[PDB]
Design a protein around this ligand. Structure first.
Ligand SMILES: [Mg+2]
Length: 257
């Protein structure tokens, strides 16, 4: 897996600020990192994650061999550190998704997420979704919101929001909703890559996600010669469909690219 062929694109769109962050790096000889963070309420929370995630992960790697466990601890560590940082005034309502992929030894893929940023494995030409959206229509998420003293309010567009404010049920930051069910504990997915079958991994933010489903995302990517082109093609398509949000994509090529 060569990081020199990863594609990335981040387009601000019709917003005053780009609140998306993305990154990838080689953390150790065995472990590669890829992440998108889709901010809301100001970029503070996404930028924080973008600034602190590598080190938080690298510190944990000699202590935790289980990548799913590691990523869970890391997300909670990062949220704890962010909350100290905001405390010490819009920062109290700054929040972010976080979708983090670790790839160990070129073959063991672990994805941890809170929120609605997607990670899609293209396996044998078909989308395999490696995240599930943390949104208020989800039965388990609904139930935990009520259990912790939050509630769901539906806006005039028929969209559900936690306490009438937040469209997702897990995030980093959103400190005012951390005691009402909006947790930083991620869900994780583990998959063994198969380099004959597996074509790429694509991470996307809501500027894309609101415009296209995950099959359409794979479609855009597959019509492109390289990941770099693919990553721009995905973001530009979202914009052409009239998206108003920041649009960010990371395309990581695998054996079957
Ligand atoms: Mg956003």
């Amino acid at each position: 897996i060569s990081l020199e062929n990863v594609g990335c694109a981040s387009q601000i769109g019709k917003r005053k600020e780009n609140e998306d962050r993305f990154d990838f790096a080689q953390l150790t000889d065995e472990v590669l990192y890829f992440a998108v963070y889709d901010g809301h309420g100001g970029p503070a929370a996404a930028d924080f994650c973008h600034t602190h995630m590598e080190k938080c992960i690298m510190d944990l790697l000699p202590k935790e061999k289980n990548l799913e466990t590691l990523l869970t601890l890391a997300f909670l560590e990062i949220d704890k550190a962010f909350s100290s940082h905001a405390r010490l005034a819009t920062l109290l309502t700054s929040g972010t998704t976080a979708t983090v992929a670790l790839l160990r030894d070129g073959i063991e893929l672990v994805v941890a997420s809170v929120g609605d940023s997607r990670a899609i494995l293209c396996r044998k030409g078909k989308p395999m979704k490696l995240t599930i959206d943390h949104t208020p229509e989800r039965k388990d998420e609904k139930e935990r919101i009520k259990k912790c003293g939050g509630f769901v309010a539906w806006n005039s567009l028929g969209q559900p929001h936690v306490n009438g404010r937040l469209a997702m049920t897990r995030s980093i930051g959103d400190l005012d909703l951390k005691t009402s069910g909006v947790i930083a504990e991620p869900e994780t997915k583990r998959i063994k890559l198969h380099h004959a079958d597996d074509s790429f991994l694509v991470l996307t933010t809501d500027g894309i996600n609101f415009m296209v489903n995950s099959q359409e995302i794979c479609d855009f990517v597959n019509q492109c010669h390289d990941p770099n082109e693919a990553a721009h093609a995905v973001t530009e398509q979202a914009i052409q469909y009239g998206t108003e949000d920041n649009s960010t994509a990371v395309v990581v090529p695998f054996g079957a690219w």
